[PDB]
Write a protein that binds this ligand. Sequence first.
Ligand code: SF4
Length: 350
Amino acid sequence: KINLLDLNRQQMREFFKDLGEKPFRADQVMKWMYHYCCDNFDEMTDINKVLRGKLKEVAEIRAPEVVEEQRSSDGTIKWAIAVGDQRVETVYIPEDDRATLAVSSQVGCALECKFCSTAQQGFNRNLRVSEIIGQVWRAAKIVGAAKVTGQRPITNVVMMGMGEPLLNLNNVVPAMEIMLDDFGFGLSKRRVTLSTSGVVPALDKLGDMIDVALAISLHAPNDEIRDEIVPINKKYNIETFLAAVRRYLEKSNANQGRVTIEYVMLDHVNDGTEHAHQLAELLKDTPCKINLIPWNPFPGAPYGRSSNSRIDRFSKVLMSYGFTTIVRKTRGDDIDDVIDRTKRTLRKRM
Ligand code: SF4
């Protein structure tokens, strides 16, 4: 059975044609899937039995399942999501005017960024389209589908710190196409943001495939620091990454001219005022908005949290050069064993 969550609108229409159905039936089923978060053909009431029968034989709608849910007092929701026998994260961050979903692109990651908890476990595999868009679908079903509640559950999707998306371009791009589709989640290209640590040839490729908002996972004011913090910098240095960013902005207007620059503040490693002055000089030819991230250590992380006074001084330095600078909020602060699986088998035996 084909999982319909693997298909963009064009592919859905091609599949429905091969079942002897008119293209617009594919569009209709898409709306049920994404506007109503429906994974059950019986519930699709304006589809006839014959078509319902065809789909149940050759197709299904199977989104990744929640294995854990944590809910913050600030409304943030974090999910551990089963993708096969592997696990990934999905985070829902509601605000008064919008709701952002952070989704995973890979199971683990191969880039070895030193501050990243996703890195420490290493790279396992790429996610399929159904596993990426399925995170959005699952989040949307739980929060409340657009046409069930009358409100878009999600206005923004981000891909950051949950696998390098540019190393999973085959699955990431169609997933984003469904996010942007009116019959999918109907998000503006300005509100689908792909963060990358700078896989430059893949970024050149991204701009030829799709127009979405780009963020750059920079985290350092110079190569010698970034070489340490973000090892991929050894292969593609800052100036090469920035040249690639400018090339991407020739092809895409989702950023409206200004790339988002992400920068984790790491205690006495990259958060000094000297580093801020260097960053300002570095970004003089790159129109941008700078997002400073008050990063917190995971168990055994090689860095500590920067104080808010150091972060605020770093920010003021950047603002004195005229950069738009945002210190990001920490969300879901209240929610932030190797034997357990075997231990559960033994306990359930009794
Ligand atoms: S590219 Fe992103 S997910 Fe991968 S190790 Fe670096 S910060 Fe973590």
